[PDB]
Amino acid sequence: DVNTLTRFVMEEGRKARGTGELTQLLNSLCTAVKAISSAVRKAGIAHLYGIAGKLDVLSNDLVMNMLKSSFATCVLVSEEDKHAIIVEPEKRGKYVVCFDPLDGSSNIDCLVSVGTIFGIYRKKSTDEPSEKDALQPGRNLVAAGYALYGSATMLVLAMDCGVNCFMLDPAIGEFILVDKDVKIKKKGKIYSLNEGYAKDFDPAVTEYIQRKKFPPDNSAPYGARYVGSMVADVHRTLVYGGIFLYPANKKSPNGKLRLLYECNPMAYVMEKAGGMATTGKEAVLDVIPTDIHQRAPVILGSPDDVLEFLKVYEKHS
Amino acid sequence: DVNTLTRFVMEEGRKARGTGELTQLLNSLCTAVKAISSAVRKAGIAHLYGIAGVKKLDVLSNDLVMNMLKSSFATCVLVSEEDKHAIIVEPEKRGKYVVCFDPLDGSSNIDCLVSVGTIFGIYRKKSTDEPSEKDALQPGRNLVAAGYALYGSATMLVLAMDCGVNCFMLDPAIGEFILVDKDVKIKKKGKIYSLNEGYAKDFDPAVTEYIQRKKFPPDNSAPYGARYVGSMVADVHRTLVYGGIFLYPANKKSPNGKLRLLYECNPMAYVMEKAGGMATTGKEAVLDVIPTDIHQRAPVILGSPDDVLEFLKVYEKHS
Amino acid sequence: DVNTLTRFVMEEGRKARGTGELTQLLNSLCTAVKAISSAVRKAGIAHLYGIAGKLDVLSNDLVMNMLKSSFATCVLVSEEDKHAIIVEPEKRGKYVVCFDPLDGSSNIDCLVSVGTIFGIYRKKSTDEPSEKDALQPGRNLVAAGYALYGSATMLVLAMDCGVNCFMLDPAIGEFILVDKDVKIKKKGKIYSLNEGYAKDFDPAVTEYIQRKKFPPDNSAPYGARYVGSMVADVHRTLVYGGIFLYPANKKSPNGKLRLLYECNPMAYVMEKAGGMATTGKEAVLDVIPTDIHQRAPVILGSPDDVLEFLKVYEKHS
Amino acid sequence: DVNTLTRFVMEEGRKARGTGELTQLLNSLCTAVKAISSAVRKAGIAHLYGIAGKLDVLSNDLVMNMLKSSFATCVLVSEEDKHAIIVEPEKRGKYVVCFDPLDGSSNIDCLVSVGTIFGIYRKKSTDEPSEKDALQPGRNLVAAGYALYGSATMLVLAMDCGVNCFMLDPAIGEFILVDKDVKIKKKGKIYSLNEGYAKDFDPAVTEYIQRKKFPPDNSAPYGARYVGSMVADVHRTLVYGGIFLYPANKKSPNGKLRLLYECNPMAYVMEKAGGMATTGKEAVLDVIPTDIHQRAPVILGSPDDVLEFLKVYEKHS
C-alpha cells in the first residue's frame, strides 16, 4: 500500500493513542516544507523579474507561522532568531521545536542543495514556557529530521519507531514513503569534511584522514565528498554510509555547527538509523546546553567508521 | 524588460540574420531540459508507488534529448554518453548541426539527491559528405554553442555562445527559463579548490604539491576552502559563481583522466572560456585537443585564470 | 490563521474526541482528489504525445485505492462499478463511501468542468459487510461533498458543523480554507436545466420555467446557465443562489441522476448550506434506496426557489 | 512526431520565410497565457491566506507587458483599458493586437471556465500609430484564437493554414499540439444561448429556438448548454458542433459581446475551422468597426446550423 507522510503520522499516532498534538505539529511542518521547496525551486520567479511589468527569511517565517498556528508548540528556537520565540498564550502547546529553516542558504547562489533541519522536545514542566525549555540534551528528542531540497525534495523523519524517508511528489504536493525503517551501512567508503582547513586540524583528525587516504592494511582508499551543505552531506552519509566530520580545531574548540538545530537532530537521525554521532569526547545527544546558539563539534556516520575515528581520538588522549 | 530563453535566442537569431536552425535546436533542447527537470524532481512518483495501483532517469533523459533534437530538423549527428555509436539522424529530419551531450551527468549518485545536470555542445557540420561519426570529431574550438542544465536547489540553464555566458532560471510555475544573470564572468582568483582528495595516494606529484600549497601556503595567506559535490555540473557551476578551481587531472593509473572530452570537458571548457576563465589538460587547452574517439577521455583543470596558471606553474616545475 | 483541510479536519476531530477514522478517510480522499486534479489538468500529457520517442478509469482507481488503504472504510459504491466493493478484512474500517470519481467526464473532450462527488456513511450493523450497507437514506450521512475541477480546484466539504470550501494551491498541494460556514442565498436569480428537452418536460416544469422567463409582476426575469456538468452547476447554485433541476418526466419517472453518489451528497451539501433538495414528491435526503445505482429526480438550491417550484409542482399534482 | 506551440510557429515561420516578428509576438502571448493559467489555477494562493504570516488586472498586465516587450506590436486594445495603448516608440513593431485578457472573469467566483481571447492584425495605415489602427474588419486578421482555462488549459490558434489545438502540459510548461487542422461538424446537436432573455428575443431567434426543441421533421430535439463564459461555449461549439447565440436584447440593443476582441477572434477561428459567424445582417468579420469597445450580436457555429438560423432571419425580413 502507498503511504504518505500525513497517513503514516496518523497511524503511528493512533497506535500510540496520543492526543494528536504531535501529528498536528508534524503536518504543519510538512506544509511549511512544501512551501519552502516551492520557493527554493524558484516557483513564481518570473514575477520578481518583471513579467507583469530573503529566502532564508521566508523559510523562517513559514516555519514560524506554521508551528505557531499548529497549536502544538510553546517554544521555538531558530537559527534566524537571537532569542527563543515564546508562542502567544492562546496558540500554546506542549512542544519545543528547534529548527534551521534553510541550512546551506548562504551558498544558494550556486544552487547548492539546501535543507531544513528540525528537532522536537516535550516542554520541561508546567512553568510558563521560556528559553530554558530548549536547553535539553538530544537524548530528550521526541522526533527529529530534515527536508533536503536537492535534485528532488525529500523529508527524513526519525522517531522511536525508526527512520523513514518520504519523497515529495510535486505533481500532487504529497510526501510518498519510499524508504522504510532505514538503517545506515555498518561501514562506508566515503569521508566528508572540509580538507581545506588541514592546517588547523586536531592531530587525531589528521591521523584519521591519513588512514582514509593511505590505509596501512592494503584495502581501498575512501572517496571524499564535501558539498558544504550539512543536510546534503549528512543525507549522502545516511544513504551511502561513511563518515561526516565537523571537528573541534584549536581555534574553534566547540566546532562551527549548532547543537540545538543542526547537530542534535542529525545525531538523532543517525542513532535511530543505527549509526553514531560523537563530539569526540561524548555522544552529541548527551551534551547539556547552556545557550540556544551554542556550537558543537560533530562526527557522525556508519558505526564502524565513527568507532575507528574514536579509537584514534582515544590514542591522542 | 523580462527575458526568457526563447526570447533571447530569437533576439540573437535576428541580429545575425540566421535561418533559425540554431534557434529551433536550442528551443528543443530547452523543452527536453524542462522534461528532465520535471522527472528529476520526481513529479508523478506517487504512481510508481501504487497511489492508483517505468523508465530509469538516465535512460529517460537520453530519450528526451535524442527525440527532441531529432525532431528539431536542425541536427544530423548526435553523440550521447549513453550510446556507443553516433546516431545518424534520418534524412527527412536532417539539419546542419552536430550535438554532443550528457543527458544526465552525475546520475550514478541520484540515490542521495545530489545535484545532477545536462551538458551539451553544438557544432556545425564541416564536410560535404553523408553525415557520420567523424563529424563529431571536431576540436572544442569549433563549438558554436555549449552549456549545461543544473538540476540543483533550483534549475538553471547556462548558455554560452560567441556573445558570452547567460544564466536562465527555470520558473517551474510557468515552464519558462528566465534570464537572471547576463554575460557572466568568473573571478580572476577564487578561494576554493575542487577535486577528490580521497585518491591522494594516486595523485600526480604536481597535483600533490598544488593541493599542499592550497592547504599550507608558503606566502602564509589564508588557506583555500575545499568543495567536491562529486557531480561535475554542480562543481563547475560553483566554480563559475564563486570562482576558484576544479580539477579532474591525469595520473599514472588514468593517463588521460576520467571525464569525457566531447560531452563533458569540451562544453565546460567552452563555457569557462566565454566567461573569461581557463581550462587545461595540463599539457594543452582542452578546446584544442583533436578527438579521435567520440568517447575518449581528457584530464581537466578549469576555473579562475589565476588559480589555473598557479597549477600550471607547479605542473611545469614537475615537467 | 491560515487553515488547510488536514489541519481543519484534525481540529474538528480532536474537538469531537473521535478515534481518527473519519480523518484518515478525508485525508485519503483529499490525496486522491489532488491526483485526479493533476491528471485532469493534463500534467505529463507530453509523454503520451511522444516527447520521449482512461481518465474516468484512473479517477476511479485513485479513489478506490486511497479509500481501501485508509483503514477507515468497509463498503465502496462507485459510479464506475456494477456492484459494491467490499474492503478485504485486514483493511476494514467503519465507513461506507459512495462516490462518483469523475462526474461530467462524459464531455471532458471540450474541457468542461468535471468533479468528484462523495458521501460518507457509518456502517449500521455488525453483519458481514455487503452492498446493503450502502442502502441508507441521505439523512444518515456523516459527511458529503465534492471536488470541482474548474478554473481552479476546489473541495467543498459538508458535515454537521456546516459547509466549508477549500481551494487547492497547486504550488504546494494543500487545500486552503477560503470560505467558512457557507450559506446559500434565500432567493436566487438563475435557473439551471437542460431546456433543449422541453417537449418532454413535465407540465409543472414547463410552467415553472415559463414563470422564470415571464414573471407575472414587474420583477426581472431569471438568467439561465447550464454547464451540463452536475458539480459545476451545483457549485454555481451554491455560490450565486438559484435553482438547478434534473426533474422527473413521463419518459424518465425517476430522473436520470443517480441517488447514492450524485443527488444525496448534493442534497446534503445544500441542506447544510440552508438550502433545499427535493424529488418533487419528497426531500432527496429522505429517499430509502433499494438499488445502489437507482435514479432520482432532483431540484435543488435556494429555499425560496425550490418552495416556489414545489408550489407549481403541486398545482399539477 | 510531438509538436509544441513554439516549434509549430517556428516551422510555420520558416516555411513562409517571414522575418520572425509574428513568431516573437505569438511566443510572448504563449508565455503570458501560461502565467495566467498558473494564476487562475491559484498557484501560491496559500501566501495570500497567511501561510508565512486582482486577477483580471494581473491577466491584463501580463498580456500587455509581454506584448510590449516582444517588439512585435504598435497598438494594443484590451477589454480592460478605455483607450488603445500606443506602444512606446523604441518597442514598436508592425502588429495590432486586440485582446480580452480574462473573459468570463466576472463569474470566476464560481470557478467557471475562463479564457483569454486575441486577434492580431498587421498595421495597415502608414500614419503614426493610433486607435484607428485597431479598427479594421475581422477579414483583415492575420491570426486569432484563445486560451481556455477549463479542466485543462488549451490554446487554440487559427491562421491561414487553419485551426490547431495545443494542450498545456503544466508539468513542463509547454503547449503540446493535440488536434491538427481542426474542422467543425457540418451540423451539430446542441444550441447555446441564455434563454432567460426569451422575453426580449426578436421573432427570428424565438422561432429558431422553438425548432431546436420541437423539430418540424421529427428529428431529435437539440440539447441545450450555456456555461455563460464565451470561450467555453465557443470551444464546445468547436469541439462538438452546434450553434452559439448571443443576440441583441433590451439591455443590449447593439448586442452584448465586444466585436474587436470577442466576436472577431471567435469568428475567425470559426471560419478557418469551416464554420460560420453572423450578426444576422452580415458576417461578423465583414463588420467595419468605428469604436474599439463596440458590441455586436453574434450567432456562430456549424455551417448547417448557422444556415438554418439565417433562413429563419430571412423569413422575418
Ligand SMILES: O=C(/N=c1/[nH]cc(Br)s1)NS(=O)(=O)c1cccc(Cl)c1
Ligand atoms: O497522533 C496522535 N493521535 C492520533 N489519534 C488519531 C489520529 Br488521526 S492522530 N497522537 S500523537 O500526536 O501524540 C502521536 C503519538 C505517537 C506518534 C505520533 Cl507521529 C503522534
Ligand SMILES: O=C(/N=c1/[nH]cc(Br)s1)NS(=O)(=O)c1cccc(Cl)c1
Ligand atoms: O534564429 C535565427 N534566426 C531567426 N530569424 C527569426 C527568428 Br524568430 S530567429 N537564426 S539562427 O538560428 O541561425 C541563430 C543565429 C545566431 C544566434 C542564435 Cl541563438 C540563433
Ligand SMILES: O=C(/N=c1/[nH]cc(Br)s1)NS(=O)(=O)c1cccc(Cl)c1
Ligand atoms: O479525527 C478524529 N480524532 C482525532 N484525534 C486526533 C487527531 Br490528530 S484527529 N476523530 S474523527 O475522525 O472521528 C472525526 C470526528 C469528527 C469530525 C472529523 Cl473531521 C473527524
Ligand SMILES: O=C(/N=c1/[nH]cc(Br)s1)NS(=O)(=O)c1cccc(Cl)c1
Ligand atoms: O517566424 C518567422 N520567421 C522565422 N525564421 C526563422 C524562425 Br526560427 S521563425 N516569420 S514570421 O514571424 O513572420 C511568420 C510567418 C508565418 C507564420 C508565422 Cl507563425 C510566423
